[PDB]
C-alpha cells in the first residue's frame, strides 16, 4: 500500500475532523535552542503528554548556506506493568535550505502530514509493514 | 504561538483540501530495512521528489520488548546556483512501545500531523520562530 | 510553641491583610535554570530587594522519575556599619515527586506558608527559639 | 507570571481560609540543633507527615556577627507503586543578620509566604515554568 | 557640523515619524549572555534583519561596584557581487554604574539616539566627516 | 518585551520632545582618527559631559571594499564615594559597506535610535533583562 500510493501536492490546506481539545503550557525543562510545553490538561505529571520544539539556524560558510532544521518531538509517557515508565515518541523534523520557495515549504509540511495520516500508510505505521 | 496552542486528541480522522495528485512507484535505491518510492509524475531525475520508508519492529530482549521505530523521509531535490544539488527534507519518525493502545497509536499520528499543519505553529516552521 | 501547634491542611486558599504593593521586573543577573526579578519600586541598587527563582523538573532515569525541585530566594540587602554589604535571605524550596496528588501539591504550598506566618511559630522564627 | 508580579510588603498579617486541623507532637527523632514533630492525626507511620525545625545561631567572630539560620522542613512521605516510599519536601529557611529591623524580619516571613501561596506563582511552583 | 551641534538633554521622550512596522521573534540562535530576535516579516533568512541583545549586570568586588554593560547589535545582511554575504551593523552599548541617577540613565539613551538621528551629524554618519 | 517588540523601518525622520539645549565645542584633546567635543555648558571639567567621534573610511584591497566604521562615545563623568572618578558611557558604532542603499543607511540610524528609546526595551536597558 506504500507502493503506488497517491497524495496531494500543493494542497491549499489540511484539517482534522476531531474530538476534544488539548492545550500546551510552558514546562521550564531546559532545552537548548527550543522550548518544552506540556499539556496542562492531563492530571498526572508522571504521564503528561509533552512536546519539545527545536530550531537550528542555517550556517553561513563563506557565502554558502546550509539547510536549517526545525524539530518537534511529541511524547506520550506510559507506565508499564513492570513499573518502568517509557516514552512513545512522534518526531517531525523539517530541514530546509533558505532558497526553497515559500510555497514549497508549506507543500512539504502538508505532504508530510498526509504521509502520517493517510489510510494507504496505515499498514506501514501500525504494523511496520514494508512495501 | 507555541505556548498556549490548542490541538485535537482522539480525532476521528484528518483530511486535506488540496490540489493535484502525486503518485509513487518503487525506486530500487538500496535502503536497509527500508524502501525508496519516487514520484512517476516528476520527469527530471535530478529534481524528482522521492520518499524513503524505514521500519524497525519491536524486538524482545531478556524477556521484554523494545520500542519500535518507523521513519519516513520525503525529499525535494534542488540544484543550487553553486552547482551542488541539495536535498530538502521532511522526516517523520514514530516510535511506539508495544504496550501503547491501538487507538493512541493513531492519536499520535494525527496529533503529530496536526503539529505540522495547524496555523498556530505556522510561524514556527516557516520562520524558525520560538514563541 | 512548636510542640502541639495546629495548622490547616486542605485549605481552600490563603490570603494577606497588608499594606503597600511591590512590583517585580526582570533583572538579567545570570542564574542557571533560573530567573532574577528585582523590585522596580526600590531605587538604590545597593539595597534593592530582589528574588531569584530556580526550577528543576522531574527527570526520568532508568525507567522512573526523580523528584523535582523549585527554589525561590528573596533577599533584602543591607550595608553594615563595617562597610560590607550583607544579604538577608528567605529561601523556600519545594521538592515534589510526580506521583503526588495535584491537590496535595497546593496543600504543601499552603502548609509551608502557614509555618512562616502562624503565630504559634512566631517565637521560633524571630527568637530562634526551640520549644 | 513571575515577571511583573505584585506582592504586599509590610503586611499587617496573613491568614488562611482553610479546612481541617492538624496537630504536631514530639517525634523523638534525634535532630541536631532542632526538633522533629509529626502529625499524630495520620494513622499510618509509614506515611505520617512530619516537620523538622532547626536553629543555627549567629557566630561571633572578633566583633563581627554572621547571619543566623532557622529552617523548617515539612515532609509528606508517600508509598510508590514500586513499593519504594519517597518524600515530598517543602523547606523554608530564613537567614537573618541580627542588625535587621524586627519589622523587616516579619515582612520577610510574610513576603515568602506570599511567594508560596499567590496565584501569580502557580505556574512556577506546579509546572516548573520559568518567566 | 559636529562642532557646535546642539542636542536636547533632560528630554521627556523621543518619537519617530515613520513608515511601516517591523516585528521581532525569538530566533533560537544560542547566544552567550544574550538573545537573538529576528524579523518575522522578511521572508528570506539569507537577508532577514536580526538583532542580538547582550547583558552583563554590575559585579561587586568587596563592596565596590563595576559599571555594567547592555549591548544591542542590529544587522542587515546583504550578498555582494562577490557572492560573499556581509553583515551591515549598528551597535549600541550602554555602560552604567549603579550609582548614576535613574533619570540620567534615560537621558543617556535619548542623547545617544539624538546623536544618531539629528541632521547635524548626517555628514559624519554617512560619509565619515570629522568636522 | 524584547521578544515581539515592534519598531518602524523606512521612517521619514525621528524627533525628540524634550527639555534644555546643550552645545558642543572642540576640546583639543588629541584623538587618533577622531575628535573630542565637550559640553560648553557644564561648568566643572571634572564633570563635563563629552563626546568623542572616531571615523574609518572603507579600505580597498585589489578591488574589494571593506565595511567602514563610524564610532561615537558619549560620557557622563561622576566621582564616586570612593573618590575614584568613573565614566558613564553610551557608545554607538555604525559599520557600513559602500554598496548598501543610501536610504538603508539612514534606516539603520533610525532603527538603532528606536532600539534605545522605545518603551519595549526600557527593562533591557535599565536593568539588563533578556526577555
* HSE, side-chain direction, 13 A CA sphere, residue B86: 17
Cα dist from E100 to C44, E67, E68, whole Å:
10, 10, 12
Whether A27 sits inside 8 A of D129 (CB atoms) is yes
Which residue in the block uniquely carries the three cell numbers 562577490?
E82
Distance between CA atoms of residues E66 and E98, nearest Å: 8
How close is the nearest chain B Cα to the Cα of E130, in Å? 42
Chain breaks in chain F (C to N over 2.5 A) after: none
Q: Are A131 and A120 in contact (CB under 8 A)?
A: no
Question: Diameter of chain E by CA atoms?
Answer: 55
b/e map C36-63, b = 16+ CB within 10 Å: bbbbbebeebeebbbbbbbbbbbeeeee
Kindly tell me the burial class for residue E83, based on how many C-beta atoms sit within 10 Å of its own C-beta (0-12, 13-18, 19 or more): exposed
Whether E23 sits inside 8 A of F6 (CB atoms) is yes
Kindly tell me the burial class for residue F72, based on how many C-beta atoms sit within 10 Å of its own C-beta (0-12, 13-18, 19 or more): buried
> Does residue A40 belong to the interface with chain E, where contact is any CB pair within 8 Å?
no
Cα dist from A94 to A71, B73, B96, whole Å:
6, 10, 21
Distance between CA atoms of residues B75 and B86, nearest Å: 10
Tell me the chain A residues in contact with residue D127 when contact means C-beta distances shorter than 8 Å: 25-28, 38, 40
Tell me the chain C residues in contact with residue F127 when contact means C-beta distances shorter than 8 Å: 25-28, 38, 40
SS3 content of chain E, % helix, strand, coil (to 5): 20, 40, 40
Distance between CA atoms of residues E111 and E9, nearest Å: 7
CB-CB neighbours of B36 under 10 Å: 17
- Main-chain phi, psi angles of E109, to 5 degrees: -55, -50
Resolved by: X-ray
CB-CB neighbours of F52 under 10 Å: 18
> Does residue C45 belong to the interface with chain E, where contact is any CB pair within 8 Å?
yes
Distance between CA atoms of residues B72 and B51, nearest Å: 7
Q: Are D66 and D58 in contact (CB under 8 A)?
A: yes
How close is the nearest chain C Cα to the Cα of F127, in Å? 5
Tell me the chain E residues in contact with residue A54 when contact means C-beta distances shorter than 8 Å: 28
Checking phi first, is residue B83 left (phi over 0); if not, alpha (psi -120 to 50) or beta?
A: left
Q: List the chains bordering chain B where 3 or more Cβ pairs fall under 8 Å.
A: A, E
Which residue in the block uniquely carries the three cell numbers 500500500?
A1
Q: Are F27 and F53 in contact (CB under 8 A)?
A: no
Dump strand ranges (E) for E1-131: 6-8, 13-17, 24-26, 34-39, 50-56, 60-61, 64-65, 68-79, 85-96
Whether C43 sits inside 8 A of E102 (CB atoms) is yes
Whether A89 sits inside 8 A of B94 (CB atoms) is yes
Q: Which residues are CB-contacts of F62 (< 8 A; sequence separation ≥ 6)? A: none
Tell me the chain A residues in contact with residue B92 when contact means C-beta distances shorter than 8 Å: 90-93, 112, 115-116
Determine the residue among C24, C25, C50 to mutate to test chain F binding: the one whose Cβ has the most chain F Cβ atoms within 10 Å.
C25
How close is the nearest chain A Cα to the Cα of D92, in Å? 22
SS3 content of chain D, % helix, strand, coil (to 5): 20, 45, 35
Q: Resolution to 1 decimal, in Å?
A: 3.5
Amino acid at each position: 500500500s506504500i507502493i503506488g500510493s497517491s497524495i496531494k501536492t500543493g494542497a491549499t490546506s489540511a484539517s482534522i475532523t476531531g474530538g476534544s481539545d488539548i492545550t500546551f503550557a510552558l514546562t521550564g525543562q531546559t532545552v537548548t535552542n527550543g522550548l518544552n510545553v506540556s499539556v496542562s490538561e492531563d492530571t498526572d505529571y508522571r504521564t503528561r503528554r509533552n512536546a519539545t520544539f527545536k530550531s537550528r539556524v542555517p550556517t553561513v560558510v563563506n557565502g554558502n548556506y546550509s539547510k536549517g532544521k526545525n524539530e518537534v518531538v511529541f511524547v506520550i509517557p506510559m507506565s508499564l506493568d513492570s513499573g518502568e515508565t517509557v516514552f512513545n515518541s512522534v518526531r517531525i523534523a523539517l530541514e530546509i535550505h533558505p532558497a526553497l520557495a515559500s510555497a514549497s515549504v508549506k507543500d512539504l509540511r502538508l505532504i508530510g502530514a498526509q504521509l502520517l495520516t493517510d489510510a494507504d500508510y496505515d499498514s506501514f505505521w501500525t504494523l511496520g509493514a514494508l512495501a
